[PDB]
Amino acid sequence: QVQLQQWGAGLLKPSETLSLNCAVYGESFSGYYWSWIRQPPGKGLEWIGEINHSGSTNYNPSLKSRVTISVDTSKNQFSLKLSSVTAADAAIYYCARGYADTPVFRRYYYYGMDVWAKGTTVTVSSASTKGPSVFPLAPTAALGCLVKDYFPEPVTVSWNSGALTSGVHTFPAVLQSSGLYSLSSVVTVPSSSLGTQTYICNVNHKPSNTKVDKRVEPKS
Amino acid sequence: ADIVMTQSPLSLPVTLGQPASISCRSSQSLVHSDGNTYLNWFQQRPGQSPRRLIYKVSDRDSGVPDRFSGSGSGTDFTLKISRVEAEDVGVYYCMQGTHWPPYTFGQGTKVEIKRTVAAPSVFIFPPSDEQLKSGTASVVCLLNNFYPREAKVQWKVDNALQSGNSQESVTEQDSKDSTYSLSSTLTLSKADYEKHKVYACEVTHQGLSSPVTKSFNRGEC
């Protein structure tokens, strides 16, 4: 069974060149095309291009001017470069084994986008790393924590150091116009316990070494 | 020009143990000159890569459960699940490999669990004093554990309808109760925030006979 291993930098800034690579293990490097495909946030799949061991290529016409796909047969590896990136290029990128590269094998052999690597999430932004601010959402009652203005993903949120899990909803981050992310984590709790139970959200943002515990209680 | 692949429906509520089917239509014939019809079906889960399930219309990939089957011809195709299991939720794509470059995909069909209608519990949260003294106000409206997913949230500030200044986020369907939750965030400058009194979040949902409203008055509790 063909396995694919994928690596490359997923965080970059506008105008820079995206550079991803994949390595093939488990079967021959010959006989099929090796391809790149992407998936923009909350949208479908877009085939980018392909190459085979002999270096013949096919490219998506909408991207041909900015895409270069290359191969290195001695290591059984192939690569993608996408220049002048912009926000529109933001997506999860996958390398994948395509179709057989000759007509007779293409007609009878099962190959065709049947093996996929793990995806690399690509973000294209001018933003610099910034830890989040954590604000309370004061109070079946509901309460939570607003985790605002951080970069890049991800943050993690727990409640009472993991001891509270039931009824927790931690929402997907939205990317704000400032280019920074924001999210809320909420939990529903019995109103009768509000005065005798302590609720703390634990917020971690690794790139900025941010570790915040914010206690959330009723106001005045 | 690209071959346009059109899937329907966009979202399919399914019932465990019952059949499901989804449609894929191409803008022109997928019959290749070599006689094959290169139409593939994929399943994708959140956080995971696409997994090919069916190829050349009806060939089933190795290790793929036989409750999946593919059929159709020319420009009209169908993926069928004979008896839906919980792990079959996710997004399904079709893909044509007859005309290239480029290969092209459908825009996906979301498969989710059907359940009885459930109205959202609605909560509104005023900005914190901490946030306010930093020059910005975030007002948050929460819709908790509702179904179906469709819901409308409108912000009214002193009865003036807002638009362009809020953002929503929605959780994945709950694995245990099959509901969704939703948060809507209204963002205002501290200045604009203090120019008004009544902050209200109005929720429309199938489970609510009439729109439910939650509000607060700035500076009062």
Numbering used by the authors:
A (entry chain H): 1 to 139, 148 to 228
B (entry chain L): 0 to 220
Quote the original article.
Signalling initiated by antigen binding to B-cell receptor (BcR) immunoglobulins (IGs) is of paramount importance throughout the natural history of the disease. Recently, a cell-autonomous model of CLL cell activation was demonstrated whereby BcR IGs from both stereotyped and non-stereotyped CLL cases could promote Ca2+ influx and nuclear factor-κB target gene transcription without the addition of exogenous antigen. We demonstrate that BcR IGs derived from both indolent and aggressive CLL cases interact homotypically via their combining sites, binding to distinct internal epitopes in each subset of patients. These unexpected BcR–BcR interactions are sufficient to initiate intracellular Ca2+ influx, and mediate stronger affinities and long half-lives for the receptors derived from anergic B cells from indolent clinical cases, while weaker and short-lived for the aggressive ones.
